Amino acid sequence: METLKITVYIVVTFFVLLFVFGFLSGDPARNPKRKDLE
Amino acid sequence: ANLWERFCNWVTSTDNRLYVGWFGVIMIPTLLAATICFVIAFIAAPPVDIDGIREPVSGSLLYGNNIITGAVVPSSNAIGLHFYPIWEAASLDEWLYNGGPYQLIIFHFLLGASCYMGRQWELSYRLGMRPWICVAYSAPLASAFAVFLIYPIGQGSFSDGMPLGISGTFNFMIVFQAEHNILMHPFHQLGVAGVFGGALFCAMHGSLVTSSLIRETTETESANYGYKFGQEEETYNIVAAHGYFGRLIFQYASFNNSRSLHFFLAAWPVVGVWFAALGISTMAFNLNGFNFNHSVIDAKGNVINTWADIINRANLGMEVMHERNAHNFPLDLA
Amino acid sequence: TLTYDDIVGTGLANKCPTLDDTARGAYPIDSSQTYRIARLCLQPTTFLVKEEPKNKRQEAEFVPTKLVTRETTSLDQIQGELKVNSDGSLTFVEEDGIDFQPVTVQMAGGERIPLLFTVKNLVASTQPNVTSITTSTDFKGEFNVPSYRTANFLDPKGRGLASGYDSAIALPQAKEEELARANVKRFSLTKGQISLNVAKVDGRTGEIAGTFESEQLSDDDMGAHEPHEVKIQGVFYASIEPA
Amino acid sequence: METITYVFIFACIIALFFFAIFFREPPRIT
Amino acid sequence: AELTPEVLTVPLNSEGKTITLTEKQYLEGKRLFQYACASCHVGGITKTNPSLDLRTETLALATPPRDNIEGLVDYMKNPTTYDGEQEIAEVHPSLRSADIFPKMRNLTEKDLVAIAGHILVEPKILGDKWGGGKVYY
Amino acid sequence: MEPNPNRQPVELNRTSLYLGLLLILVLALLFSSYFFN
Amino acid sequence: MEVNQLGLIATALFVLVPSVFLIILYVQTESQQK
Amino acid sequence: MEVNQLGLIATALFVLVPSVFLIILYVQTESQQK
Amino acid sequence: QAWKGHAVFRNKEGEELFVRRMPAFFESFPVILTDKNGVVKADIPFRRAESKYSFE
Amino acid sequence: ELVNVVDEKLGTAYGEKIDLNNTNIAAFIQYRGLYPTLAKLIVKNAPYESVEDVLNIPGLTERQKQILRENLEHFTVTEVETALVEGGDRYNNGLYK
Ligand code: CLA
Ligand code: CLA
Ligand code: CLA
Ligand SMILES: C=Cc1c(C)c2cc3nc(c4c5[nH]c(cc6nc(cc1[nH]2)C(C)=C6CC)c(C)c5C(=O)[C@@H]4C(=O)OC)[C@@H](CCC(=O)OC/C=C(\C)CCC[C@H](C)CCC[C@H](C)CCCC(C)C)[C@@H]3C
Ligand SMILES: CC(C)=CCC/C(C)=C/CC/C(C)=C/CC/C(C)=C/CC/C(C)=C/CC/C(C)=C/CC/C(C)=C/CC/C(C)=C/CC/C(C)=C/CC1=CC(=O)C(C)=C(C)C1=O
Ligand SMILES: CCCCCCCCCCCCCCCC(=O)OC[C@H](CO[C@@H]1O[C@H](CS(=O)(=O)O)[C@@H](O)[C@H](O)[C@H]1O)OC(=O)CCCCCCCCCCCCCCC
Ligand SMILES: CCCCCCCCCCCCCCCC(=O)OC[C@H](CO[C@@H]1O[C@H](CS(=O)(=O)O)[C@@H](O)[C@H](O)[C@H]1O)OC(=O)CCCCCCCCCCCCCCC
Ligand SMILES: CCCCCCCCCCCCCCCC(=O)OC[C@H](COP(=O)(O)OC[C@@H](O)CO)OC(=O)CCCCCCCCCCCCCCC
Ligand SMILES: CC1=C(/C=C/C(C)=C/C=C/C(C)=C/C=C/C=C(C)/C=C/C=C(C)/C=C/C2=C(C)CCCC2(C)C)C(C)(C)CCC1
Ligand SMILES: CC1=C(/C=C/C(C)=C/C=CC(/C)=C/C=C/C=C(C)/C=C/C=C(C)/C=C/C2=C(C)CCCC2(C)C)C(C)(C)CCC1
Ligand SMILES: CC1=C(/C=C/C(C)=C/C=C\C(C)=C\C=C\C=C(C)\C=C\C=C(C)\C=C\C2=C(C)CCCC2(C)C)C(C)(C)CCC1
Ligand code: OEX
Ligand SMILES: [Ca+2]
Ligand SMILES: [Cl-]
Ligand SMILES: [Cl-]
Ligand SMILES: [Fe+2]
């Protein structure tokens, strides 16, 4: 069923992009101590 | 802060009742999908032709199962390792007949649990903790991977994945014994040492710490009230505990270092269970348990049975009876 | 010209060959020549099951069903003698091939109907005086429908015909009589009927194509329950050859 | 009736999860 | 029980003549059988055709008879179907097909005698286990 | 959270317990025959 | 006697549920400060 | 399915009776003076 | 499962007889057959000793 | 009245001899000279109204005819049983060792 497929593909891509860009968003800096890890 | 910045701040927020985080961003939808599909299937899924021989197995409660017998049945042997998402089926009725829920559930679950582990690291990082709780979690996780992914891969079919059910679990175990003689495999024995030992040390530790609690209460109240959450002082006397256990066995067989002790407590079950998992995962490629069948022979050449051979007879019963309609040829080669 | 790698996983492997619209010719039959069908293919497109009459005992209808066993339904590489009879009719005598497929279809409401869709031992004949096979030629005949399971098949409690327990061992002291139909496995063998309606003929190559309709019983689970009546409709292809 | 019972018990357990998490007695440092 | 000279005494031919194998010959026979035959004939059965086994009675009813050293050695040179009707060297290991079954290349006449002797002695020891398959394991 | 002032304690004295149990048990004694039918 | 096989659980829950409600209320009333 | 016709009441009382015991104890605990 | 069909009752003379239908009020109801004009022709008697209208 | 037809068949000569109409082909290994060539020819040319009809299979050698004659006392015929001959079960009946 093609519409379900496209929907799931879009959903998955969405969450994956959130994961990747999220960890790309200065994750090492997100801790309670030493933030200058660049 | 712009919208993305704000969103990132919320996702990774240490103040959320349940931590989300970037691993959580993947974990939440996958685990919800897996959970919902599992529950719905477990109640209402129709019988599934697990072994691809047009012999459908009923897993759901409404189709005549109880909690112990019920399962989500593995996808068809006809499918094998083919990816069978809902959209590859001509219909939901077909999807259900061929065991699509199994693949959807186990794939979402494995993704989600991997993200659960990552999420444990992530939060440990956010709270300024040391990071290795997740490594402990790698022990059960790997095991799930062993039974839901690695074994199917090795045998060439998800029909050989562990069913999502109690009795189906037992089926998987019995067939595994038949085909790999897992009991006679040292990685499984290490697994057993791991869980028996884990339980032993859990009970032991529990008992010694409980045994050396410092009197802070009266007899008419629970001793648990003798400890207040977040107090700085330790609530039991480790020196007395060590004094006891060191005399029970002998001094140098007892831990006087709480950190060393807790490291041992972490390591024994985790390492053992890692070996269990690697056991399943290598028997996945048919490097099987020790085979001492007819190892003992008398001077003439008469076979002298050992306990291994009786094991062998049981294993034979299992081999010949399992999937009684699936085999056309004399050897079960995968 | 397509290879396996071109075809694999497309679904085309479960399809019979087609002939284009220009194929409306005639294939001459020399009554002195012997003939064979080198390949008979049957691709079902619809499975219909006769609803069990409520008790009104009017005409129970054939209703649509949903295929759940995927693209595993076609009969193919079937071959056999094509006799020219004294009255000029042609008789196909099926000899061999992939002449059966287990198929499970699902009725409205969930009931699953397994059947052995088949043309085993097909004997199909045309009208008399068929001096050429044309888009007016038809074949009508009958075939055998053996038990959907063969004699070694074991039920979930280990009971079978050529193998297995002969009782309900989980009920050691239950009265046997009420369980006899389940304990005593039976092997079905019934007749089916098929019509092949030629719609296209390539006179030069000996290829014919058209539509078919067959009627046969479904699985009776080795005598445990009543079978359903099934009507199968689809397209067919055959290559005729002098031999 | 069996199925109803099983699903009921399960649902009670999930609801219990909900209360045990979001409506727990809060841990307090004294 | 011992691996006695009597156990190791097996039919040489169809004419009532016997040969007594040495213990070293028996061991060589086991070793060479494992080397060349056991992949298919483990325990006296035949994995690629279980209808035909290496039981002595079965060999006795083969054509020509194979329940003696000579029959088996000839088989190892020029294998036939069970009725002797076709020569099957092309799909079965033999000296004649040592080109396509390379493990047969270093097998000597002595080796063939040893293998044959293993085949005849083993059922005298193991009984129904030889050619019995999993049922008798 | 800041506490809710609309909160009230709830009470059931012993006499009310006895009266209630009497009601429930007698109702059960009456209707049970009809539940079993 | 061929009674309704749910009569037993019906009667049992009919008795037990409200009785329990009342017992809960009474006991948490007694434990209140005097 | 031909289940045991007492399984329902058995399960129901198995859940309800101790659950009710616990709820009684909890609630009468909460209503005690802070 | 199925309608048995419409029952037509007749006496030995061949007159069609009609069964008196049960009104909703009645848990049980006697069996009484009258002709088209409501005259009693047959019934199931309770007491038999002075039965005049038995089906027999 | 329901009958297991295989069990029932075991009470006929099928249970005592090689049934040329029904018995799986590996049974011909029981006797010298029958397997696989003659076994194949026999199964391929079944059913037979009588045992001796096996001698009438086309293409036989004089040798083959003589072996068959020496083995007629081991053969029988009974009605073809659908359950034993469908599925190509006469060639492979799912039994190995
Ligand atoms: C966390 C979000 C999430 C994730 C990860 C998945 C993941 C999965 N779901 Mg979905 N699902 C979700 C939410 C999610 N689901 C939700 C909310 C719903 C309800 C609408 C569903 C409903 C659903 C259904 C109904 C089904 C699935 C199925 C699938 C699977 C196939 C998806 C696919 O083919 O993508 C294709 C997409 C890509 C390949 C993405 C490529 C584009 C990116 C940008 C490139 C980089 C990706 C690359 C592979 C590397 C990863 C990066 C990494 C290094 C960080 C897969 C297991 C199916 C299934 O399980 O089959 C058995 C299926 O049937 N899901
Ligand atoms: C007295 C009863 C007994 C004993 C001695 C054993 C002993 C053993 N079992 Mg068994 N087992 C038992 C009952 C017993 N089992 C029962 C009732 C069952 C269920 C039917 C099983 C099921 C079972 C399974 C399934 C398996 C074993 C295996 C094991 C081994 C590891 C167990 C373990 O790690 O536990 C946890 C305990 C510890 C980690 C504490 C340490 C225990 C060690 C062995 C004692 C060391 C003593 C030492 C030699 C003394 C020297 C003193 C020195 C200082 C001078 C071990 C050899 C496994 C195996 O086969 O391994 C090869 C395995 O796979 N057992
Ligand atoms: C005394 C006898 C004995 C013992 C002690 C064991 C012990 C063990 N068996 Mg063995 N076994 C035995 C006899 C025994 N077996 C016999 C006789 C047989 C032959 C019939 C087998 C056949 C057998 C097989 C075939 C297998 C085992 C395995 C195992 C292990 C199971 C535990 C595990 O995998 O943890 C690991 C932890 C997990 C699998 C849990 C994963 C949890 C995921 C990550 C999260 C799940 C979340 C969940 C859905 C929701 C949570 C609640 C929610 C509210 C959050 C363990 C080592 C298995 C194994 O070794 O696995 C590695 C294995 O596959 N056994
Ligand atoms: C059968 C054995 C077994 C189970 C079931 C189990 C279960 C669990 N262990 C956890 C944790 C751990 N276990 C650990 C060590 C161990 N765990 C062991 C053995 C087990 N541990 C052993 C032997 C060890 C020693 C090495 C550690 C160190 C941890 C953790 O840190 C972790 C934790 O947080 O503990 C509290 C939790 C992971 C939470 C999670 O992923 O939520 C995500 C999933 C959710 C919320 C629901 C998913 C529901 C899915 C979608 C259902 C469908 C798929 C299922 C697989 C179906 C299963 C059906 C069954 C019948 C087979 C979970 C309660
Ligand atoms: C009739 C006869 C003659 C009578 C005569 C009797 C006479 C008086 C005897 C005197 C002479 C005698 C000594 C001769 C001995 C004879 C002979 C040697 C007997 C052998 C008996 C027996 C089989 C020996 C077995 C060996 C031993 C018991 C094996 C088990 C011990 C085991 C290996 C310990 C190692 C494991 C170790 C890692 C455990 C730690 C993990 C766990 C406990 C953590 C929990 C924990 C630990 C802490 O440490 C503290 C602190 C806390 C908090 C805590 O949570
Ligand atoms: C059947 C198919 C259909 C499925 C449909 C299901 C979709 C559900 C969508 C509905 C949304 C409402 C949910 C709110 C509840 C809530 O979590 O709030 C509680 C807090 C409060 O939110 C807090 O909210 C605060 C504002 S306020 O308090 O709400 O006013 C705010 O300050 C703060 O930032 C925020 O974190 O939320 C959080 O802590 C962060 C969100 C974490 C949610 C993760 C869920 C994890 C699920 C794991 C999967 C396993 C499931 C298996 C079951 C065992
Ligand atoms: C003949 C063979 C040839 C040789 C081949 C070599 C093979 C490789 C051997 C592997 C080496 C292992 C190194 C261990 C070091 C270590 O752990 O240090 C960490 C601490 C340090 O000890 C602590 O040491 C501390 C000092 S310090 O940290 O070392 O400086 C001290 O403060 C403390 O009291 C003390 O307990 O060790 C401990 O905490 C106590 C020992 C716990 C045992 C660790 C093993 C893990 C569990 C076993 C695995 C399970 C297997 C069974 C399956 C169920
Ligand atoms: C679907 C989910 C279902 C779960 C819900 C659970 C249902 C709970 C039902 C609650 C009912 C409990 C009744 C409280 C009973 C009780 O508390 O009564 C005493 C009560 C007095 O209340 P007071 O105002 O004095 O305050 C006292 C407080 O402590 C009460 O909390 O009066 C009332 O409750 C009004 C009703 C009078 C009832 C009087 C009838 C009793 C007479 C005997 C009848 C039987 C014998 C007849 C012989 C012929
Ligand atoms: C009516 C009737 C019925 C009955 C049934 C019933 C008994 C019902 C019920 C009861 C119940 C029992 C219900 C329910 C549900 C539950 C709930 C509602 C819970 C909640 C959930 C949530 C909300 C949570 C989530 C969370 C999140 C947020 C995060 C993560 C964690 C958690 C998961 C916790 C019958 C069939 C007889 C018949 C018909 C009618
Ligand atoms: C056995 C019986 C049966 C069955 C029964 C049934 C089925 C029951 C069920 C029903 C049910 C199932 C009930 C329901 C319910 C509910 C309630 C009673 C209410 C509530 C809630 C609430 C109380 C909560 C609170 C909340 C929280 C959660 C949060 C926040 C907010 C609030 C506070 C609101 C019958 C009768 C048929 C017959 C006979 C016998
Ligand atoms: C020779 C070979 C060939 C070719 C090869 C190829 C050409 C391949 C390639 C190249 C490549 C192209 C590779 C790869 C991929 C890459 C990687 C592997 C990536 C990764 C990623 C990551 C890891 C990142 C991380 C994270 C993110 C995710 C987020 C944020 C944070 C971070 C950044 C950390 C063939 C196959 C035809 C055949 C056979 C042989
Ligand atoms: O699918 Mn489930 O278990 Ca693995 O081995 Mn072959 O496939 Mn069937 O037999 Mn045995
Ligand atoms: Ca036409
Ligand atoms: Cl099985
Ligand atoms: Cl044999
Ligand atoms: Fe501790």
Nearest to B204 by CA among B269, B291, B115: B269
What token pair was written down for B276? 């269990």
What residue's CA is closest to ligand 8, atom 1? G17
Structural gaps in chain H: residues followed by a C–N separation over 2.5 Å: none
Burial code (b: 16+ CB inside 10 Å, e: under 16) for B274-293 equals bbbbbbbbbbbeeeebeeeb
Q: Which residue shows structure tokens 């931590």?
A: B19
Exposed/middle/buried for C9, CB within 10 Å: 0-12, 13-18, 19+?
exposed
User: What domain range includes position C169?
Assistant: 150-185
Amino acid at J83: A
Nearest to C104 by CA among C234, C221, C222, C239: C221
What token pair was written down for C136? 């007016």
The Cα–Cα gap between A35 and E57 comes to: 84
Partner chains of B (3+ C-beta pairs under 8 Å): A, C, D, E, J
The Cα–Cα gap between B50 and B325 comes to: 12
Judge whether B322 and B178 are in contact, CB under 8 Å.
yes
Give every CB contact of residue A34 below 8 A, 6+ residues apart in sequence: none
Q: Tell me which residue in J26, J34, J37 faces E51 most closely, judged by beta carbons.
A: J26
Q: Is residue J36 reached through a cis peptide bond, with omega within 30 degrees of 0 on the bond before it?
A: yes
Helix H or strand E encompassing I41: strand I40-43
Interchain CB contact of I5 with C (< 8 Å): no
The Cα–Cα gap between C143 and C214 comes to: 10
- Tally the domains of chain E: 1
Provide the chain F residues 5-34 that lie in CB contact (below 8 A) with chain G. 9-14, 16-17, 20-21, 24-25, 27-28, 31-32
Provide the chain J residues 3-42 that lie in CB contact (below 8 A) with chain C. 3-7
The Cα–Cα gap between E53 and I38 comes to: 94
Judge whether D9 and H11 are in contact, CB under 8 Å.
yes
Report CA torsion sign: C54, C55, C59, C60: positive
Judge whether B37 and B101 are in contact, CB under 8 Å.
yes
What token pair was written down for B189? 């024995």
Q: What is the 3-state secondary structure (H, E, C) of chain B?
A: CCHHHHHHHHHCCCCCCCCCHHHHHHHHHHHHHHHHHHHHHHHHCCCECCCCCCCCECCCHHHCCCCCCCEECCCCCCCCCCCCCHHHCCCHHHHHHCCHHHHHHHHHHHHHHHHHHHHHHHHHHHCCCCCCHHHHHHHHHHHHHHHHHHHHHHHCCHHHCCCEEHHHHHHHHHHHHHHHCHHHCHHHHHHHHHHHHHHHHHHHHHHHHHHCECCCCCCCCCHHHHCCCCCCCCCECHHHHHHHHHHHCCHHHCCCCHHHHHHHHHHHHHHHHHHHHHHHHHHCCCCCCCCCCCCCECCCCCECCCHHHHHHHHHHHHHHHCCCCCCCCCCCCC
Specified resolution (Å): 4.5
The Cα–Cα gap between F11 and B292 comes to: 74
Q: Tell me which residue in J36, J96, J97 faces E82 most closely, judged by beta carbons.
A: J36
Residue C176 and residue C222 share a domain: no
DSSP state of I39: -
Asked if residue C10 is part of any domain, the answer here is no
Is the backbone of residue B213 left (phi > 0), alpha (psi -120 to 50) or beta?
A: beta
Ligand 6 neighbour B16 (Cβ under 6 A): yes
Judge whether E56 and E126 are in contact, CB under 8 Å.
no
User: What domain range includes position E24?
Assistant: 2-130
Ligand 9 centroid to G28 CA: how many Å? 27
Asked if residue C69 is part of any domain, the answer here is yes
Q: B324 contacts in C (CB within 8 Å)? A: 154, 158
Give every CB contact of residue I28 below 8 A, 6+ residues apart in sequence: none
Asked if residue E126 is part of any domain, the answer here is yes
- Cα three-residue angle J10-J11-J13, rounded to 5 degrees: 80
Q: Tell me how close the Cα of H7 comes to any Cα of chain G, in angstroms.
A: 10
DSSP strand pairing (C75-84 vs C112-118): unpaired
Q: Which residues pair with J23 in a beta bridge?
A: none
Q: Tell me which residue in E1, E7, E47 faces B298 most closely, judged by beta carbons.
A: E1
Answer yes or no: do B301 and E4 touch at CB < 8 A: no
Test site for ligand 3: of B39, B119, B173, most ligand atoms within 8 A of the Cβ:
B173
Test site for ligand 6: of B8, B32, B116, most ligand atoms within 8 A of the Cβ:
B32
Nearest to B86 by CA among B100, B75, B73: B100
The Cα–Cα gap between J88 and J51 comes to: 22
What token pair was written down for B322? 């399992």
Judge whether C145 and C116 are in contact, CB under 8 Å.
yes
Does G touch F (3+ CB pairs < 8 Å)? Answer: yes
Answer yes or no: do C104 and B96 touch at CB < 8 A: no
Residue C158 and residue C240 share a domain: no
Ligand nearest to the CA of D5: 9
Judge whether B55 and C148 are in contact, CB under 8 Å.
no
The Cα–Cα gap between E120 and E58 comes to: 11
What is the Cα C93 distance to its own chain's centre?
15
Helix or strand or coil: residue E135? helix
Is the backbone of residue A4 left (phi > 0), alpha (psi -120 to 50) or beta?
A: alpha
Distance set, CA B31 to CA B12, B116, B137, J84 (Å): 19, 9, 17, 52
Judge whether B98 and B75 are in contact, CB under 8 Å.
yes
Q: In whole angstroms, how large is the CA radius of gyration of chain I?
A: 13
CB pairs under 8 A between B and C: 42
Helix or strand or coil: residue I19? strand
The Cα–Cα gap between E111 and F5 comes to: 102
Q: G25 contacts in F (CB within 8 Å)? A: 10-12, 17
Q: For chain J, what's the residue count?
A: 97
Experimental method: X-ray
Q: Tell me how close the Cα of B242 comes to any Cα of chain A, in angstroms.
A: 36
Q: What is the 3-state secondary structure (H, E, C) of C122-182?
A: CEEECCCCCCEECCCCEEEEEEEEECCCCCCCECCCCEECCCCECCCCCCCCCCCHHHHHH
Cα atoms in the 13 Å half-sphere on the side-chain side of B205: 17
- Tally the domains of chain C: 2
Asked if residue E136 is part of any domain, the answer here is no
Burial code (b: 16+ CB inside 10 Å, e: under 16) for E15-44 equals eeeebebeeebbebbbebbeebbeeebebb
Interchain CB contact of D21 with H (< 8 Å): no
Ligand 3 neighbour B198 (Cβ under 6 A): no
Residue C128 and residue C41 share a domain: yes
DSSP strand pairing (C75-84 vs C90-98): antiparallel
Asked if residue C59 is part of any domain, the answer here is yes
Helix or strand or coil: residue E18? strand
Is the backbone of residue B181 left (phi > 0), alpha (psi -120 to 50) or beta?
A: left
Amino acid at D15: A
Exposed/middle/buried for E120, CB within 10 Å: 0-12, 13-18, 19+?
buried
Asked if residue C12 is part of any domain, the answer here is no
DSSP strand pairing (J18-19 vs J75-76): parallel
Nearest to B115 by CA among B9, B35, B22: B22
Q: Tell me which residue in B11, B86, B126 faces A31 most closely, judged by beta carbons.
A: B126
The Cα–Cα gap between C81 and B65 comes to: 52
The Cα–Cα gap between B334 and B153 comes to: 11
Amino acid at B288: N
Ligand 8 centroid to B329 CA: how many Å? 75
Helix or strand or coil: residue I2? coil
Nearest to C123 by CA among C110, C142, C145, C151: C142
Q: I2 contacts in C (CB within 8 Å)? A: 54-57
Ligand 4 neighbour B223 (Cβ under 6 A): no
- Cα three-residue angle B190-B194-B200, rounded to 5 degrees: 135
Q: What is the CATH number of the domain that holds C61?
A: 2.40.160.30
Exposed/middle/buried for D20, CB within 10 Å: 0-12, 13-18, 19+?
exposed
The Cα–Cα gap between E30 and E37 comes to: 10
Asked if residue C25 is part of any domain, the answer here is yes
Judge whether B191 and B184 are in contact, CB under 8 Å.
no
Q: Tell me which residue in E3, E50, E126 faces B299 most closely, judged by beta carbons.
A: E3
What is the Cα H12 distance to its own chain's centre?
8
The Cα–Cα gap between C237 and A23 comes to: 59
Q: Which residues pair with C189 in a beta bridge?
A: C146
* DSSP symbols for chain C: ---HHHHTTSSGGGSPP---TT-B--EE--TTS-EEEEEEEEEEEEEEEEPPP-SS-S-PPEEE-EE-S-S---EEEEEEEEEEPTTS-EEEEEEEEE-EEEEEEE-TTS-EEEEEEE-TT-EEE--S--SEE-TT-EEEEEEEEE-SS-TT-B-TTSBBSSSSBSS-TTSTTS-SGGGHHHHS----EEEEEEEEEEEEEETTTTEEEEEEEEEEE---TTTTSPPPEEEEEEEEEEEEEE-
Give every CB contact of residue G7 below 8 A, 6+ residues apart in sequence: F32, F35, F36, F37
CB pairs under 8 A between C and J: 48
Ligand 2 centroid to B183 CA: how many Å? 14
The Cα–Cα gap between H32 and E21 comes to: 96
The Cα–Cα gap between C193 and C213 comes to: 8
Interchain CB contact of H32 with G (< 8 Å): yes
Nearest to B255 by CA among I50, B36, B264, C104: B264
For residue E127, what is the nearest residue in chain B, using CA coordinates?
A: B302
The Cα–Cα gap between J30 and B187 comes to: 47
Exposed/middle/buried for E5, CB within 10 Å: 0-12, 13-18, 19+?
exposed
The Cα–Cα gap between B328 and B118 comes to: 45
Residue C198 and residue C111 share a domain: yes
Is the backbone of residue B156 left (phi > 0), alpha (psi -120 to 50) or beta?
A: left
Q: Measuring from each residue's beta carbon to the nearest atom of ligand 8, which residues come in under 6 Å?
A: F 11-13, 16, 19-20, 22-23, 26; G 17-18, 21-22
Helix or strand or coil: residue I43? strand
Judge whether C118 and C145 are in contact, CB under 8 Å.
yes
Helix H or strand E encompassing E73: helix E69-77
Q: Is residue E64 reached through a cis peptide bond, with omega within 30 degrees of 0 on the bond before it?
A: yes
Residue B64 neighbours by CB distance under 10 Å: 14
Test site for ligand 8: of G19, G20, G21, G27, most ligand atoms within 8 A of the Cβ:
G21
Ligand 6 centroid to B15 CA: how many Å? 13
Ligand 4 neighbour B269 (Cβ under 6 A): yes
Dihedral pair phi/psi, residue C86, rounded to 5°:
-60, -30
Nearest to B193 by CA among B247, B274, B119, B255: B274
Distance set, CA F27 to CA F16, F22, F24, F35, G23 (Å): 16, 8, 5, 12, 17
Among the CATH numbers 3.40.50.970, 3.40.50.300, 1.10.150.320, 3.40.47.10, which is that of J1-86?
A: 1.10.150.320
Answer yes or no: do B328 and J94 touch at CB < 8 A: yes
Q: Is residue J47 reached through a cis peptide bond, with omega within 30 degrees of 0 on the bond before it?
A: yes
Q: For chain D, what's the residue count?
A: 30
The Cα–Cα gap between C209 and C205 comes to: 12
Is the backbone of residue C11 left (phi > 0), alpha (psi -120 to 50) or beta?
A: left
Judge whether E109 and E25 are in contact, CB under 8 Å.
no
Residue C90 and residue C155 share a domain: no
Residue C97 neighbours by CB distance under 10 Å: 19
Interchain CB contact of B303 with E (< 8 Å): yes
Judge whether J24 and J42 are in contact, CB under 8 Å.
no
The Cα–Cα gap between B146 and F24 comes to: 56
Ligand 10 neighbour G3 (Cβ under 6 A): no
Ligand 2 centroid to C152 CA: how many Å? 44
Dihedral pair phi/psi, residue B314, rounded to 5°:
-65, -50
Nearest to E70 by CA among E6, E130, E14, E30: E14
What token pair was written down for E44? 């006296």
Exposed/middle/buried for B119, CB within 10 Å: 0-12, 13-18, 19+?
buried
Does J touch E (3+ CB pairs < 8 Å)? Answer: yes
Domain B3-184 has CATH 1.20.85.10: yes
Q: Which residues pair with C110 in a beta bridge?
A: none
What token pair was written down for I7? 């029952």
What is the Cα J85 distance to its own chain's centre?
10
The Cα–Cα gap between J43 and J56 comes to: 13
Does I touch B (3+ CB pairs < 8 Å)? Answer: no
Cα atoms in the 13 Å half-sphere on the side-chain side of I40: 12
User: Is E41 part of any known ligand binding site?
Assistant: yes
Ligand 7 neighbour B272 (Cβ under 6 A): yes
Helices (H), H1-34: 7-30
Q: What is the CATH number of the domain that holds E87?
A: 1.10.760.10
The CB-based long-range contact list for B306-312 (8 Å cut-off, 24+ gap) reads B308/B184, B309/E137, B311/B181, B311/B183, B311/B184, B312/B181, B312/E137
DSSP strand pairing (I16-19 vs C138-146): unpaired
Distance set, CA I25 to CA F37, I18, I22, I30 (Å): 21, 20, 8, 13
Judge whether E95 and E73 are in contact, CB under 8 Å.
no
Dihedral pair phi/psi, residue E9, rounded to 5°:
-95, 110
Answer yes or no: do B61 and D29 touch at CB < 8 A: no
Helix or strand or coil: residue E84? coil
DSSP state of E108: -
For residue C54, what is the nearest residue in chain I, using CA coordinates?
A: I1
Q: What is the CATH number of the domain that holds C160?
A: 3.30.2050.10
Amino acid at B137: Y
The Cα–Cα gap between E32 and E107 comes to: 9
Q: What is the 3-state secondary structure (H, E, C) of chain J?
A: CCCCHHHHHHCCHHHCCEECCCCCHHHHHHCCCCCCHHHHHHHHHCCCCCHHHHHHCCCCCHHHHHHHHHHHHHEECCCCCHHHHHHHCCCCCCCCC
Test site for ligand 11: of A19, A20, A38, most ligand atoms within 8 A of the Cβ:
A20
What residue's CA is closest to ligand 2, atom 12? B196
What is the Cα C170 distance to its own chain's centre?
38
Ligand 12 neighbour B321 (Cβ under 6 A): no
Does D touch B (3+ CB pairs < 8 Å)? Answer: yes
Q: Longest C-alpha distance within chain G, in Å?
A: 53
Helix H or strand E encompassing A23: helix A2-24
Distance set, CA C131 to CA B143, B237, C23, C27, C136 (Å): 71, 108, 18, 9, 12
Distance set, CA C82 to CA C128, C137, C238, E41, I23 (Å): 14, 14, 11, 46, 74
What is the Cα A3 distance to its own chain's centre?
24
Q: Which residues pair with I18 in a beta bridge?
A: I34
Helix or strand or coil: residue E19? strand
Helix or strand or coil: residue I6? coil
